[PDB]
Write a protein that binds this ligand. Structure first.
Ligand SMILES: *[C@@H]1O[C@H](CO)[C@@H](O[C@@H]2O[C@H](CO)[C@@H](O[C@@H]3O[C@H](CO[C@@H]4O[C@H](CO)[C@@H](O)[C@H](O[C@@H]5O[C@H](CO)[C@@H](O)[C@H](O)[C@@H]5O)[C@@H]4O)[C@@H](O)[C@H](O[C@@H]4O[C@H](CO)[C@@H](O)[C@H](O)[C@@H]4O[C@@H]4O[C@H](CO)[C@@H](O)[C@H](O)[C@@H]4O)[C@@H]3O)[C@H](O)[C@H]2NC(C)=O)[C@H](O)[C@H]1NC(C)=O
Ligand SMILES: *[C@@H]1O[C@H](CO)[C@@H](O[C@@H]2O[C@H](CO)[C@@H](O[C@@H]3O[C@H](CO)[C@@H](O)[C@H](O)[C@@H]3O)[C@H](O)[C@H]2NC(C)=O)[C@H](O)[C@H]1NC(C)=O
Ligand SMILES: *[C@@H]1O[C@H](CO)[C@@H](O[C@@H]2O[C@H](CO)[C@@H](O[C@@H]3O[C@H](CO)[C@@H](O)[C@H](O)[C@@H]3O)[C@H](O)[C@H]2NC(C)=O)[C@H](O)[C@H]1NC(C)=O
Ligand SMILES: *[C@@H]1O[C@H](CO)[C@@H](O[C@@H]2O[C@H](CO)[C@@H](O)[C@H](O)[C@H]2NC(C)=O)[C@H](O)[C@H]1NC(C)=O
Ligand SMILES: *[C@@H]1O[C@H](CO)[C@@H](O)[C@H](O)[C@H]1NC(C)=O
Lengths: 111, 58, 255, 487, 74, 212
């Protein structure tokens, strides 16, 4: 697998994003499969740590070449602080790739 | 045979035309041969060697 | 000519199935002049054995075909399993593409690799792959009107919904469809998108309402979002060639 | 190049700060030649300002080699490459020795060894033959040392006054040199670089043997029992900060029951009445040993004879490995690249990455005593007394297969029979010879490890395993099979 | 007339195939002028071989007088 | 791998009983005015009338080797929420009704069942959605798929069609008007019977019947 994130400051494997009240964080990833792919189902599985303080909207699209585009939109629920980690895991990918899982951390707080 | 295949170009000799050379032919001072190409018009070139040939054609 | 057909089932989308007295299913694709025996076949034996290995609950050693029918272009057969103790009638699926992919005697040749020879099956499909690009919007092509009604938010820490919250959700969805019905009045109204007349003045108070919810000061902790209940005109969603197409007086499409 | 430091950090306060990554490129937009490295801030790291103790000179460190019994490492959460190594020693050696590094053990020579014996003795009241350090953990602002004779906590690393590290002893009573030596410390590694209000550090201490668990909040000066009032033994207690809960791993002696219980963390104290019904492991789970959180994440791992992983907060666990009469001794992992390494008994090393149900085996290490370490860039190191081995082969990124010579073969001595089921897919049936001893069956069976692995053939062959089936009765003479895609 | 492209296939020579599939632009056709306090934009399209990874670079004859910033994006 | 399970509930028994109910009531009920009156700090104008559909869609999912309830708890704890796509099919009588075809995209709301709950927080957990319907159709197809978070469950197409062949009694139990629900399937029925056709109007038949 190959993970493409062309947006600057989102490229680093570990990243922490801050959300204020009513603010929203949007990002997009592309997955290029160097081989066959599990086409009916998306190649990325994602989980959230304390979904009670973060609402997540995910959109995924396949294309002609089987590349997978996903957009994640992260927003806070209401006025409280805490932190949650959303992990995006290539379940199909082997243990030999340099990057399999991505662990953004979303903080509701003063940046 | 290998690499390139020879062919010779020879025109205007279909009848026994007899035009004698006028003046003294030029010769390139250096032992090695050289071909100087006009950069802009590819067809025009000068062969410098034992005898000097300036060809409008290639 | 030895077999006799008991009945015929059609997909109305280019495929057809045939059931005989011997209880063997044949498949016909309207593109070709070929009928294929799907159920008594090598591929079906392979697929049935795989369903045994996976321990499927729909597959048993002894079963009787009750009937089969097409559901949205998929062949579903309802069958009575004679499992000891847990005998039951259930509707299973017949993936004919999978059955054809597993039919196994196929033209093959012995190719040569690195001082070794291996069995390379000879491809029969004229093309490696087929793709549809520049597809046309499914919802515009099929002329479908689509609404969205997301559930109201709750301030509960664990995020669960009470019965009253579900009642609020129920009433809001009802009112959305009620406006859908009342939009058919003859008079134009000033602004299109009927839900406008529902929100109207309240659209000026959203921040206030949101404030009362963020600090959990708002009534029963429910939050009713204006944008949650609305009719979507243009979205980029599921794609491919739509099933239905509608044409009117010389308008055209491309594939 | 010459960069003023005010262009990077612009403040100088002793606080937990994250270590930077460096990428040298020929052209940033036209990224053509690039090199990866790190950058560390020496005026802000909390642990580096303090003086650890009496520095051991050369020819004095090596005298500890005949006496060393085990190796332990602290990771220094926010900024790696700042690890500390502790020697656990036999009762012959009367001291506490801890070494510190700055470059992540890339060079053995650049490791400074100190003896903190006198600092402990200053606050020590129970002298005995052996005082060697049992365990040590480095939090964001504090250091906790489980010494043989007691538990000690650093005063506070942010504010240095004494110019030498000052350790205060935390008190429990009735704990003999015997109870302290079987203790161990559990600490959820998280980076609090900017230290928001809600972020707290929790450390638990458990001693096999009036409860054996204890746990404590930020300053670790007041330790309270982590369970209140045929008795379950708390192997591990952990604090889930994200969902604000307490997670217990319970093992009941005299039976085989083992279960994880999650309880709401009411008022900072774990409540009774579990949050949601507790997950019970099978009776085949012989001896659990521990339970950890992968750093800066919410993945929960339970290890021992077997390895289980839990998505979410311990509601359900999926067994990713079973080990028969073998158990996982130590675990190592890195927040960067999310590598996970389990060191099993016999020296085998299992590897995985966080969130993956599938795992692999890296190889077998025969060193008598050793440990594995992961630095900031993800490079794996093997640490033994007198040897810090970085890898026989180096690569552009931090792969963790550098130490071992070559990847092992996962195969087994069995007979495979192949069967085409399509042009592109295939079966391999593994034959378990009739008359084979039941105790020998597993020697000739496919396992869970073979999922997602490739099958290779000496003559010409390559195919990818997509599913593993166990069927004892359906074919006679074959007990397992793999469904495979041909390449 | 030697055809070097065909001669660079003798098995004795055993060369390696070109690692770039395509490298094209319309900049080659015309020359450009930069006046005082002026700048210009140039574009190229490049496609690599299926497996190889070629590294493109941009150079200028006179670095004292001309400065460039190049961006490669998929 | 995993499969969805969808069941129809009543308004008066939303969480109490998890057994299936039949789509017998086709008239909206007005038992919602009270809660909307009770709701103040919300953009709800007292003038406008609010009443409810009967019935709910109860949704859970099952994966082999694990019981349903811990799977539902798991899916909730990982952040997954079902998405429901209800598509209506127009009636055949285009003289009376309109050919227009509508869709409605909703998201399921998690609810804990009203049981004992030995646990302090969570128990049996189910995702509920309103079941809406409109005048001029009797066939609706419901597509359920996850929102992309948590465990992956394949998109599943159900049909929630109106049942017009039922009748109420004095006791109030839904009993069939056509015949008696007094038989149990036996292996003897299907042992000697051959396959038979299933005949219906292709897209507009709500109810299937098989004889022979
Ligand atoms: C990853 O790596 C990056 C690398 O830079 C790192 O970024 C740094 O994080 C620091 C957090 O610890 C940031 O510290 C903050 O600095 C503030 C100053 O901001 C000013 O910003 C201007 C424009 O950006 C800039 O011109 C200005 O420059 C200089 O400021 C000096 C004062 O420090 C002054 O002497 C110079 O003349 C010049 O003006 C500054 O950069 C601080 O104001 C801020 O809060 C203060 O903190 C300091 C010490 O912490 C304290 O003395 C002071 O009272 C403030 O503390 C209190 O803050 C709280 C809220 O935080 C309030 O409630 C109180 O009222 C006080 O305000 C803070 O410290 C640093 O700016 C940043 N560097 C860059 C270049 O961005 C990331 O943190 C790293 N991430 C991780 C996860 O590790
Ligand atoms: C998940 O959803 C399914 C279906 O949506 C639920 O299955 C149903 O469970 C109920 C249990 O109350 C079964 O009810 C029946 O009740 C009668 C009367 O007591 C009893 O005699 C029957 O034996 C049975 O218990 C119902 O048959 C069953 N339906 C199906 C299709 O399986 C399931 O309970 C839900 N699980 C969770 C954890 O929410
Ligand atoms: C399909 O359309 C019919 C009629 O267009 C809908 O039924 C109608 O619903 C309204 C609102 O509930 C009823 O208004 C009520 O009138 C009675 C008597 O005037 C009164 O008790 C109420 O206070 C209210 O004013 C109307 O009577 C009723 N019509 C009939 C014939 O029952 C129906 O709800 C629509 N179905 C769906 C699924 O939307
Ligand atoms: C939600 O459930 C509650 C019960 O927990 C319902 O409240 C009951 O309403 C009946 C009305 O006939 C009263 O007799 C009961 O005393 C009420 N229960 C309690 C505990 O007070 C409520 O009606 C339900 N919600 C909706 C919208 O119907
Ligand atoms: C250092 O930062 C200053 C701005 O504070 C900037 O003018 C200068 O160019 C920087 N130095 C380098 C080497 O970039």
């Amino acid at each position: 697998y190959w993970i493409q994130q062309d947006s600057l400051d989102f490229m680093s494997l570990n990243l922490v994003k801050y959300i204020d009240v009513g603010n929203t964080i949007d990002f997009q990833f592309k997955i290029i499969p160097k081989a066959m792919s599990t086409f009916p189902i998306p190649p990325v599985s994602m989980v959230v740590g304390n979904p009670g303080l973060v609402e997540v909207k995910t959109q995924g699209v396949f294309d002609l070449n089987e590349n997978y585009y996903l957009d994640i939109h992260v927003s806070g629920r209401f006025f409280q602080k805490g932190s949650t980690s959303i992990a995006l895991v290539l379940w199909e990918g082997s243990s030999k790739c340099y990057a399999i899982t991505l662990l953004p951390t979303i903080k509701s707080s003063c940046s | 045979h290998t690499l390139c295949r020879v062919h010779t170009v020879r025109t205007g000799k279909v009848f026994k035309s007899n035009i004698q050379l006028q003046g003294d032919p030029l010769f390139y001072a250096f032992p090695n041969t050289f071909v100087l190409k006009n950069v802009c018009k590819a067809d025009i070139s000068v062969y410098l060697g034992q005898k000097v040939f300036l060809t409008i054609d290639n | 000519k030895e077999s006799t057909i008991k009945y015929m089932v059609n997909s109305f989308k280019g495929q057809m199935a045939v059931v005989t007295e011997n209880e063997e299913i044949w498949y016909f694709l309207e593109g070709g002049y070929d009928v294929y025996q799907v159920v008594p076949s090598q591929g079906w034996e392979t697929y049935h054995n795989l369903q045994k290995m996976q321990k499927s609950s729909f597959h048993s050693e002894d079963e009787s075909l009750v009937s089969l029918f097409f559901e949205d272009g998929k062949l579903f057969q309802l069958v009575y399993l004679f499992d000891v103790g847990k005998e039951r009638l259930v509707k299973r699926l017949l993936p004919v593409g999978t059955l054809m992919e597993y039919n196994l005697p196929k033209p093959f040749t012995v190719v040569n690799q690195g001082n070794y020879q291996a069995i390379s099956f000879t491809h029969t499909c004229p093309f490696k792959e087929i793709h549809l690009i520049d597809v046309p919007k499914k919802h515009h092509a099929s002329r479908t009107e689509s609404y969205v009604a997301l559930p109201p938010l709750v301030s509960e820490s664990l995020g669960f919904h009470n019965n009253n919250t579900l009642a609020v959700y129920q009433g809001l969805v009802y009112y959305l469809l009620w406006l859908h019905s009342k939009y058919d009045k003859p008079y134009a109204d000033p602004v299109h998108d009927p839900t406008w007349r529902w929100w109207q003045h309240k659209t000026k108070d959203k921040d206030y309402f949101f404030y009362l919810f963020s600090n959990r000061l708002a009534a029963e902790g429910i939050y009713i979002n204006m944008n949650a209940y609305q009719k979507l005109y243009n979205m980029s969603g599921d794609y491919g060639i739509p099933d239905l197409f509608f044409l009117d007086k010389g308008n055209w499409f491309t594939i | 190049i010459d960069i003023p430091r005010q262009n990077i950090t612009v403040n100088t306060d002793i606080a937990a700060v994250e270590q930077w990554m460096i990428k040298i490129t020929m052209h940033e937009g036209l990224n053509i030649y690039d090199t990866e490295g790190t950058l560390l801030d020496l005026v802000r790291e909390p642990i580096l300002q303090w003086n650890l103790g009496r520095v051991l000179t050369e020819m004095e460190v090596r005298d500890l080699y005949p006496e060393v019994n085990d190796i332990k490492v602290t990771k220094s959460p926010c900024a790696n490459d700042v690890a500390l190594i502790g020697f656990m020693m036999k009762p012959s050696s009367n001291g506490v020795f801890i070494g510190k590094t700055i470059s992540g053990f890339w060079t053995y020579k650049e490791c400074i060894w100190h003896d903190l014996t006198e600092i402990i003795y200053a606050e020590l009241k129970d002298e005995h033959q052996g005082l060697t350090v049992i365990d040590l953990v480095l939090t964001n602002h504090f250091l906790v040392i489980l010494t043989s004779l007691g538990l000690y906590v650093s005063s506070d690393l942010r504010y240095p006054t004494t110019s030498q590290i000052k350790l205060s002893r935390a008190e429990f009573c009735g704990f003999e040199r015997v109870d302290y030596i079987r203790g161990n410390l559990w600490y959820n590694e998280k980076c609090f670089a900017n230290r928001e209000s809600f972020e707290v550090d929790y450390v638990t201490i458990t001693f096999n043997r009036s409860s054996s668990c204890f746990f404590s909040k930020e300053p670790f000066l007041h330790w309270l029992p982590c369970v209140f009032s045929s008795i379950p033994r708390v192997i591990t207690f952990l604090i889930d900060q994200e969902t604000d809960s307490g997670i217990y791993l319970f093992n009941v002696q005299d039976t085989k029951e083992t279960y994880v219980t999650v309880a709401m963390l009411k008022d900072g104290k774990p409540s009774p009445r579990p949050k949601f019904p507790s997950f019970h492991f099978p009776s085949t789970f012989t001896l659990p040993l521990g339970m950890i959180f992968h750093p800066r994440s919410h993945f929960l791992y339970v290890y021992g004879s077997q390895i289980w992983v839990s998505m979410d907060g311990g509601n359900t666990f999926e067994m990713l490995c079973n080990l028969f009469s073998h158990h996982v001794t130590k675990t190592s992992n890195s927040f960067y690249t999310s590598d996970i390494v389990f060191i099993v008994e016999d020296g085998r090393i299992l590897t995985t990455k966080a969130g993956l149900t599938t795992y692999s085996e890296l190889g077998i290490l025969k060193d008598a005593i050793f440990t594995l370490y992961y630095d900031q860039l993800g490079y794996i190191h093997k640490l033994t007394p007198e040897n810090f081995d970085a890898g026989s082969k180096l690569l552009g990124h931090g792969n963790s297969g550098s130490i071992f010579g070559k990847r092992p073969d996962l195969g087994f001595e069995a007979i495979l029979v192949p069967q085409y089921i399509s042009t592109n897919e295939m079966y391999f049936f593994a034959h378990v010879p009739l008359t084979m001893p039941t105790n020998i069956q597993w020697k000739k069976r496919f396992k869970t490890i073979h999922l997602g692995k490739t099958i290779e053939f000496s003559k010409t062959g390559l195919a990818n395993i997509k599913n593993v089936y166990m069927h004892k009765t359906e074919p006679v003479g074959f007990q397992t099979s793999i469904h495979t895609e041909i390449i | 007339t030697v055809n070097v492209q065909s001669s660079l296939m003798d098995e004795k020579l055993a060369l390696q195939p070109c690692n770039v599939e395509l490298l094209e632009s319309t900049m080659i056709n015309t020359m450009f002028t930069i006046d005082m306090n002026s700048k210009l934009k140039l574009s190229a399209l490049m496609i690599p071989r299926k497996g190889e990874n070629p590294t493109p670079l941009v150079m200028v004859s006179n670095p004292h007088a001309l400065g460039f910033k190049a961006n490669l994006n998929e | 791998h995993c499969t969805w399970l969808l069941v129809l509930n009543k308004f008066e028994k939303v969480g109490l009983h998890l057994s299936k109910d039949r789509f017998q009531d086709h008239e909206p009920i007005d038992t919602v005015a009270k809660v909307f009156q009770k709701l103040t700090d919300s953009p709800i104008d007292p003038s406008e009338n609010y009443l409810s559909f009967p019935y709910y869609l109860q949704i859970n999912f099952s994966c082999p080797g694990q019981n349903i309830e811990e799977l539902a708890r798991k899916g909730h704890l990982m952040g997954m929420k079902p998405m429901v796509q209800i598509n209506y099919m127009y009636s055949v009588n285009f003289y009376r009704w309109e050919m227009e075809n509508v869709q409605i995209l909703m998201e399921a709301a998690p609810m804990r069942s009203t049981g004992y709950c030995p646990a302090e927080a969570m128990c049996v957990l189910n995702w509920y959605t309103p079941m809406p319907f409109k005048n001029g159709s009797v066939v609706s197809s419901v597509d359920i798929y996850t929102n992309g978070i948590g465990p992956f469950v394949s998109k599943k197409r159900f049909y929630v069609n109106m049942n017009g062949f039922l009748k109420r009694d004095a006791s109030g139990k839904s009993l069939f008007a056509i015949g008696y629900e007094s038989l149990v399937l036996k292996s003897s029925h299907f042992r000697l019977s051959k396959s038979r056709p299933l005949w219906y109007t292709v897209n507009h038949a709500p109810v299937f019947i098989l004889g022979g």
